[PDB]
Design a protein around this ligand. Structure first.
Ligand SMILES: NS(=O)(=O)c1cccc2c1c([N+](=O)[O-])cc1[nH]c(=O)c(=O)[nH]c12
Ligand SMILES: NS(=O)(=O)c1cccc2c1c([N+](=O)[O-])cc1[nH]c(=O)c(=O)[nH]c12
Ligand SMILES: NS(=O)(=O)c1cccc2c1c([N+](=O)[O-])cc1[nH]c(=O)c(=O)[nH]c12
Ligand SMILES: NS(=O)(=O)c1cccc2c1c([N+](=O)[O-])cc1[nH]c(=O)c(=O)[nH]c12
Lengths: 396, 395, 169, 396, 395, 169
């Protein structure tokens, strides 16, 4: 039994040196090999590949390395590791039906509470509403001015604007229309202000009560048009070839984007990609196998998440040299175990059960409400400037 | 070489206007294109031939003889079979498959929630219609009483009393304040009433918006495991009922305990029956079926359904072949070549999406447009009244 | 001049209120006692679109005790009608035997009191009635509302007449 | 094997007549007998008592009836039913260690949304706060009046009260103090009003957002002093004797209360008590065995709940005639099954798994806010009356 | 007849000032009174004698010999044993018990939440201290700018400008209003600022009160099964760890999976250690132990703990006896007689409660008293200022 | 008369603001860069109660870009100090070469602008600083606040002096 060390599939048990035998190792593939033996009824000893890779065709030597090399050269009988079933290996050895399906997925940093931006106090209401409010304020002021001037029954343009503004802010009004039409306008404006302000306050309370952190992307197409978040696979790997060898245009655009990279949106190791996305502060998204992504999402510090759905589909399968008298029983055992409700159990036990991770709200801070302070000081400056200008003009 | 198949759509189906075509060209579908590709790769010839029984395959319990498509294979009638043939142990014993050309599993189908356009007058929902009516009645009564009391036996007036009451309800200041004790009493009471009413309105609106915000739609199977106002079911008897029956998982164990108390019956005799039941249950019913059919249905008009969460189990449709046949090698290798160079993805997108008949929490303007319409109407009425007053001023 | 408008409005308001009290057309609701749609009324719930159509009877009304008591004895709508009648009588008595300048004042007082009584009766009726089943309000309810509106208008008109007449002195 | 029919312990399986054999019955005791047999390895046939009672000492015949009668007279070998272990039966037969412990508990109707009472709009704030608000209003009005009168720098007593009242209601004030002390008072009052009203609105929103139905009673002592909710056991039964034979004073008071009953707070059957509490609209509380109470709380329509904790302690135990060669093995089997994690499993399967039961808020209704309408109309009547009185007084 | 016992409190314990007493009278406790009653009923004589090892009993693994109190029984040394002897299968095989005189099971102990008295100035919590400071700064700045702008080059005034700004912040109306464009600009901006600030304050207060309302304290074991900010543990090795180990229940299975990831160590070497750890964990730690000891501790000062939910399992303390002894009958019958006539309940209440050293959502006045104190202080300051103004008016 | 009060207050406000800017005693916080309590300042965070006590250096400041820029270049507190100085100079220049009636006006304008600049600088400092770890504000912050208060008082006093003097004409 030749395996490879990749977590969680084959890892050193507690006291790697103090524990000897088949108990030195722990992981998913260990339990899988045990379950496969419980049906095959064979004798096996846990082993590990030498080169350090699962297996591939040598560039020129054409000598199989890793698990496939060990299996095809009699070093080991069966293999149990996250082997990506593919044509090239299917040509030299006979796999089984996949014991775990997967595909390319998307990995991002778990979205956090972004520091509230200036003008965050407008979040409760959409900009359409604010624009309509301003337009209605202007319109009602103008209508009141017209009605007052043409039916005097004094409400000038300036005083009309002042009255409307002081009405929208629930403040006292020095003048109130004495004409029936003016009273109509005033009452209608009053209703509008009351409703609008109550809605604003209520929606703000809802915002402050429950937090909803929403990921900016929901799928591959979502970030295929984002053009803001960098996303790249391994500099050289299966995913890079898949994007390169793609014939579907949505992935073609992503591949072209990755081609014109500045800097190169690529890494040399998976840990490199994890560290980059963790330290990119929501600016990099990594594409990798959904198994590894679900794995990482359950390991501390739990600073990342899997988003979207699988783009391609693959499978991990037992391997066996051609003509082995053990391919059929292992295939049958894999399948029966799969439909017996076991591989799901093992996956839950390892990915999720052994998981690093499975609120009294806070007062408001200046960061939330500094925009209105800036507006206040700007208005004070503007008012001093305008009074100064008027004084200078009237002086001459 | 004969090819066995079945008519489940969007796999091999009857081409529109089949009279104008015959033979292999008489049918179109996903499996048809897949078999075409496989023929082009391996290099043999085929003649499509549909199964007669219409059943995929199962061991007859009375007689160990098979019954269905795998029956048409294992007894030498057929050479291969390209169809959604879920590979299982019993079939693997007697028929041999290739690597799965298309993976899948149990999913969840729910009625698509139509975008509930808020009513034009949705801003009054916080308070009941009766309360608004009684508000109007009380406003009239208070204005009249204030006039009456202040007048007989000042600056006030029926018009002015109405104005004062209206401005006091809306907390927009009063031009004139009663100077008599009774006027002050009525004014204070009106003030109390308006304050309470407005505070209640605002609070209830906050409750509406907060409750409508912390609603989590069914996005997983566990979410279903903790739901009682929504029921779910499966086919009357299939791989799904068996999967839940022999389930060693806790969540599915709970769901199977729930389905044990099946009353009122949730199971369904036919999948189309389940789709109709969900489409007519108005979001109170969910269905469990294969992810592929769920995705396909979510694209076939009407667009009244969608798929949620992820696959609960894992299976795979595979190309079968007679045990000990002379095509395992080429067929498996061709399947893997097709999958590796991204043809199956193209074909799936073509048949599920390309030939498909379908496909922020800030308060929006739609929630409030009623008050804007009221304002425009009031402004128009004001301009009309101004014109009338101007004409009347001529006397 | 306005005395005629006042008197006709008082008569109309009394007629509307008496009709609304009399008619059993207040509520449209689907009930279960009838074994179904129903045009329930102030006094007797009366069936419709059912086997016992037309064959209908009085209702059974059984802190909250007091609300049930007052709802059963619709004393406030009845008081509004009585005050409307008495105010109309006072207006008539002021049309003759004039030069009193204290009668139409009482008439307006009674009209306002009748309006308040109608408001109270409506509030009580709705509060007690309530306890999803859709429903609606029959034209008896709108008749009561129109009677209240007319009562308020008549009160204001009568007091305006009083103040104008007393402004002569 | 003699049992008794009481649910869920022994019930007729689906198709009671179409199902024959040992499958005709279903329930907890059936599974328990099966588990006990799986250890004893005996041969048994499900049976039922004849008289219709578990067992008791005849008043004069002294002939044991029910399960105990059948067991002590050779009719049956072992018994499996909810038998209340007690001294009298322990004298004639040998039980086992209890396979289920229980005690007297409290049963009430599941509390519902009471129709909002008049003056429910004061719920957000405690009456202490309202009283303090009124006192502060009076005090500030008086202080303002004093300051205005003694330092005139016009604010009379009446106008001072008017100003304060219009300030507390966020309404315009015709007069504003021009004296520094008056301005101090006004600003302080303004702050108080703002804070109070905002707190009122916020607490009301909290009330309307989340519903919390709180039971009026938390234990036996809770309703021992309630003196409002009737509570009574069976007219004649074990619980009645237990309360009668009690020596602890807290239950002595409850027993005395039940003695002076008008009407008699007692029933003749458990179904009678269930129906009474369900139809008493939260005015009757039933005391019964916690097993039956937990059972009922899981059966439709689920209109009741169990509150408090057990008052006494009992146990259900297997029974066996004296000298039987099967008492010891059954005792050991009961105990081993209990600590093996089974009886808990069976209880969960029957009480809970086979359970009849395991929101977009609504607009406000007049019932919630009718009190303020009543106050408004009362104020209108009072104002008309006071103006009339003043007019009559000034007329003379 | 010799009686075996152990010193676990509130069962048999060392009587205060033991020197002034000897023999049976030298000890007092629950088990002491129970044995006294049993002696009075059965009618024999006894001499209390405590175990030497101090262990209840367990089969030595190396040698099948017992070790502890049950050891002192099974080897003929002792006649009976009255103590919290949890009856189990292994002991039932060799020692025979009576009916359980007192039932129990695993419970939960949590730190008692002290009645957190709200701060006298808790009403400012919705907004940060910095925001209040900047509000004061902006108020001063706006008032000064309004004065300056309106004055040079009307009715306004530094005192009047301050008054206007203060009344505009509190939305209480202004008798005067700027008539100049710049004054109007500054007034409108101040109005915007106050409106936004007040709405934010009210909304955040609503959020506080709503969140503080939908908090469910740990009231069951399942509630613990879905908690991550609170950890729990048991004794290092006992019947509890074994119960979770051999647990066939789903909730306890999940809790045991959690406890498997014991890091940082939750288990405890001694129960007093666990009580101390909870008492020092500030409500972030819970403990699992026998219900009886939890109830006893919840009554022994300090009153820093309480018991929640209900028993998770079921056990029973029982009176042991040598196998084949001549006291089973009388002892069992006396236990049942005592339980039936309500003595054990009396005794338990006496020793757990009688000799114990312990034992609405409307906004309350404590939440707000700060503004009342501010108001009283302002009124006193106003009276003082009025007196000063009166004295100064004499000139 | 009040000219002396104005001038001494302007000098005091400038001194307070210059001291607050100079002193690195703005914030009291427990930081981790020091490897611990710290009296952080406007310019250089400076350690305390630690191994590197006293040995302290400037800080590293790296839409939000602009906030970082403005915080790093404390141009608004510096502008407040500069405006205070220039206004004091204008007051001095108005004490001599009098009969202008347009200088102290500018002085008050500058004092108000300095107050607003101090407010803006404080807001910016607090907003950028924030990003549970307890902390507190050193007396440099309160010195800045006192400088702002004095600036406002001096502006109002200067404009009052101006209006009184110009009321002579
Ligand atoms: N760890 S990884 O980041 O996901 C990952 C990255 C890249 C290649 C992988 C691979 C994993 N795997 O799942 O460990 C298994 C695997 N198996 C093969 O046979 C092969 O050729 N390449 C791979
Ligand atoms: N139509 S369905 O509702 O999804 C569906 C329901 C039940 C069994 C199915 C099945 C489908 N399918 O996809 O049509 C294919 C399929 N293929 C097999 O080989 C087999 O054994 N069972 C099935
Ligand atoms: N159903 S009940 O309402 O709870 C109930 C009420 C009254 C007596 C009961 C009893 C139950 N039980 O649990 O069914 C069992 C039981 N067993 C005995 O041996 C005995 O004497 N009396 C009883
Ligand atoms: N003190 S404790 O923390 O609660 C406690 C912990 C662990 C085991 C206990 C135990 C107690 N007890 O109540 O003292 C009694 C007891 N009695 C037995 O017979 C036995 O086997 N184990 C125990």
């Amino acid at each position: 039994v030749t395996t490879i060390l990749e977590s969680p599939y084959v890892m050193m048990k507690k006291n790697h040196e103090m524990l000897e035998g088949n108990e030195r190792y722990e992981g998913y593939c260990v339990d899988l090999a045990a379950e496969i033996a419980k049906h095959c009824g064979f004798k096996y000893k846990l082993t590990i590949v030498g080169d350090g890779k699962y297996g591939a065709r040598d560039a020129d030597t054409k000598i199989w390395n890793g698990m496939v090399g060990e299996l095809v050269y009699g070093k080991a009988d069966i293999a149990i590791a996250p082997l990506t079933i593919t044509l090239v290996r299917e040509e030299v050895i006979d796999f089984s039906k996949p014991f775990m399906s997967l595909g390319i997925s998307i990995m991002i940093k778990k979205p956090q509470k972004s520091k509230p931006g200036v003008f965050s106090f407008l979040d409760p209401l959409a900009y359409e509403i604010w624009m309509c409010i301003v337009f209605a304020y202007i319109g009602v002021s103008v209508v009141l001015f017209l009605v007052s001037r043409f039916s005097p029954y004094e409400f000038g343009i300036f005083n009309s604007l002042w009255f409307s503004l002081g009405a929208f802010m629930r403040q006292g009004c020095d003048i109130s229309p004495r004409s029936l039409s003016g009273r109509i306008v005033g009452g209608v404006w009053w209703f509008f202000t009351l409703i609008i302000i109550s809605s604003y306050t209520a929606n703000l309370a809802a915002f402050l009560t429950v937090e909803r952190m929403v990921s900016p992307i929901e799928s591959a197409e979502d970030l295929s048009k984002q053009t803001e978040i960098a996303y790249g696979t391994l500099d050289s790997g299966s995913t890079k070839e898949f994007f390169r060898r793609s014939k579907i245009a949505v992935f073609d655009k992503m591949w072209t984007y990755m081609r014109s990279a500045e800097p190169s949106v690529f890494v040399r190791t998976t840990a490199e990609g994890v560290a980059r996305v963790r330290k990119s502060k929501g600016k990099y998204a990594y594409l990798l196998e959904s198994t590894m992504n679900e794995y990482i999402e359950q390991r501390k510090p739990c600073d990342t998440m899997k988003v979207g759905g699988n783009l391609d589909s693959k499978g991990y399968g037992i391997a066996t040299p051609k003509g082995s008298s053990l391919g059929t029983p292992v295939n049958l055992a894999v399948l029966k175990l799969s439909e017996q409700g076991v591989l799901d159990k093992l996956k839950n036990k390892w990915w999720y059960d052994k998981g690093e991770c499975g609120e009294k709200t806070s007062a408001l801070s200046l960061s939330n409400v500094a925009g209105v302070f800036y507006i206040l000081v700007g208005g004070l400056g503007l008012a001093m400037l305008v009074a100064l200008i008027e004084f200078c003009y009237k002086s001459r | 070489y004969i090819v066995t198949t079945i008519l489940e759509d969007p796999y091999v189906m009857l081409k529109k206007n089949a009279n104008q075509f015959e033979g292999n060209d008489r049918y179109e579908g996903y499996c048809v294109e897949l078999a075409a590709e496989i023929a082009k790769h391996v290099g043999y010839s085929y003649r499509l031939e549909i199964v007669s029984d219409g059943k995929y395959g199962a061991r007859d319990p009375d007689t160990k003889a098979w019954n269905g498509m795998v029956g048409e294979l294992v007894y030498g009638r057929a050479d291969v079979a390209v169809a959604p043939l879920t590979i299982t142990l019993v079939r693997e014993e007697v028929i041999d498959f290739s690597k799965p050309f298309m993976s899948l599993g149990i999913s969840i189908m729910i009625k698509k929630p139509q975008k509930s356009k808020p009513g034009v007058f949705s801003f009054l929902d916080p308070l009941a219609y009766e309360i608004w009516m009684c508000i109007v009645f009380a406003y009239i009564g208070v204005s009249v009483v204030l006039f009456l009391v202040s007048r007989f036996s000042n600056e006030f007036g029926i018009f002015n009393s109405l104005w004062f009451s209206l401005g006091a309800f809306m907390q927009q200041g009063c031009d004139i304040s009663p100077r008599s004790l009774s006027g002050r009493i009525v004014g204070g009471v009106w003030w109390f009433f308006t304050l309470i009413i407005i505070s209640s309105y605002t609070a209830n609106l906050a409750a509406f918006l907060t409750v409508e915000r912390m609603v989590s739609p069914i996005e997983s199977a566990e979410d279903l495991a903790k739901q009682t106002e929504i029921a779910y079911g499966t086919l009357e008897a299939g791989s799904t009922k068996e999967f839940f029956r022999r389930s060693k998982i806790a969540v599915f164990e709970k769901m199977w305990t729930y389905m044990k108390s099946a009353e009122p019956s949730v199971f369904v005799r036919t999948t189309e029956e389940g789709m109709i039941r969900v489409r007519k249950s108005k979001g109170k019913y969910a269905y469990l079926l294969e992810s592929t059919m769920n995705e396909y249905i979510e694209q076939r008009k009407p667009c009244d359904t969608m798929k949620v969460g992820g696959n609960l189990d894992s299976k795979g449709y595979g190309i079968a072949t007679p045990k000990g046949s002379a095509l395992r090698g080429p067929v498996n290798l061709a399947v893997l070549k097709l999958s590796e160079q991204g043809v199956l993805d193209k074909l799936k997108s073509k048949w599920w999406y390309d030939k498909g008949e379908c496909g922020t929490s800030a308060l929006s303007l739609s929630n409030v447009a009623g008050v804007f319409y009221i304002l425009i109407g009031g402004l128009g009425l004001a301009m009309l009244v101004a014109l009338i007053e101007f004409c009347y001023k001529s006397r | 001049v306005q005395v005629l408008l006042t008197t006709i409005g008082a008569f109309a308001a009394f007629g509307l209120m008496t009709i609304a009290i009399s008619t059993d057309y207040w509520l449209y609701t689907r009930a279960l006692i009838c074994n179904g749609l129903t045009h329930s009324g102030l006094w007797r719930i009366c069936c419709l679109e059912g086997l016992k159509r037309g064959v209908c009877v009085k209702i059974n009304h059984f802190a909250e005790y007091l609300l049930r008591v007052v709802r059963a004895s619709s004393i406030f709508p009845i008081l509004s009608a009585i005050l409307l009648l008495l105010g109309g009588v006072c207006v008539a008595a002021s049309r003759v035997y004039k030069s009193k300048r204290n009668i139409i004042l009482g008439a307006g007082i009674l009209f306002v009191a009748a309006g308040l009584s109608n408001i109270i009766g409506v509030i009580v009726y709705i509060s007690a009635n309530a306890g999803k089943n859709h429903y609606s309000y029959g034209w008896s309810f709108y008749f009561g509302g129109l009677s209240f509106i007319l009562a308020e208008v008549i009160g204001v008109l009568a007091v305006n007449i009083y103040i104008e007449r007393s402004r002569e002195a």
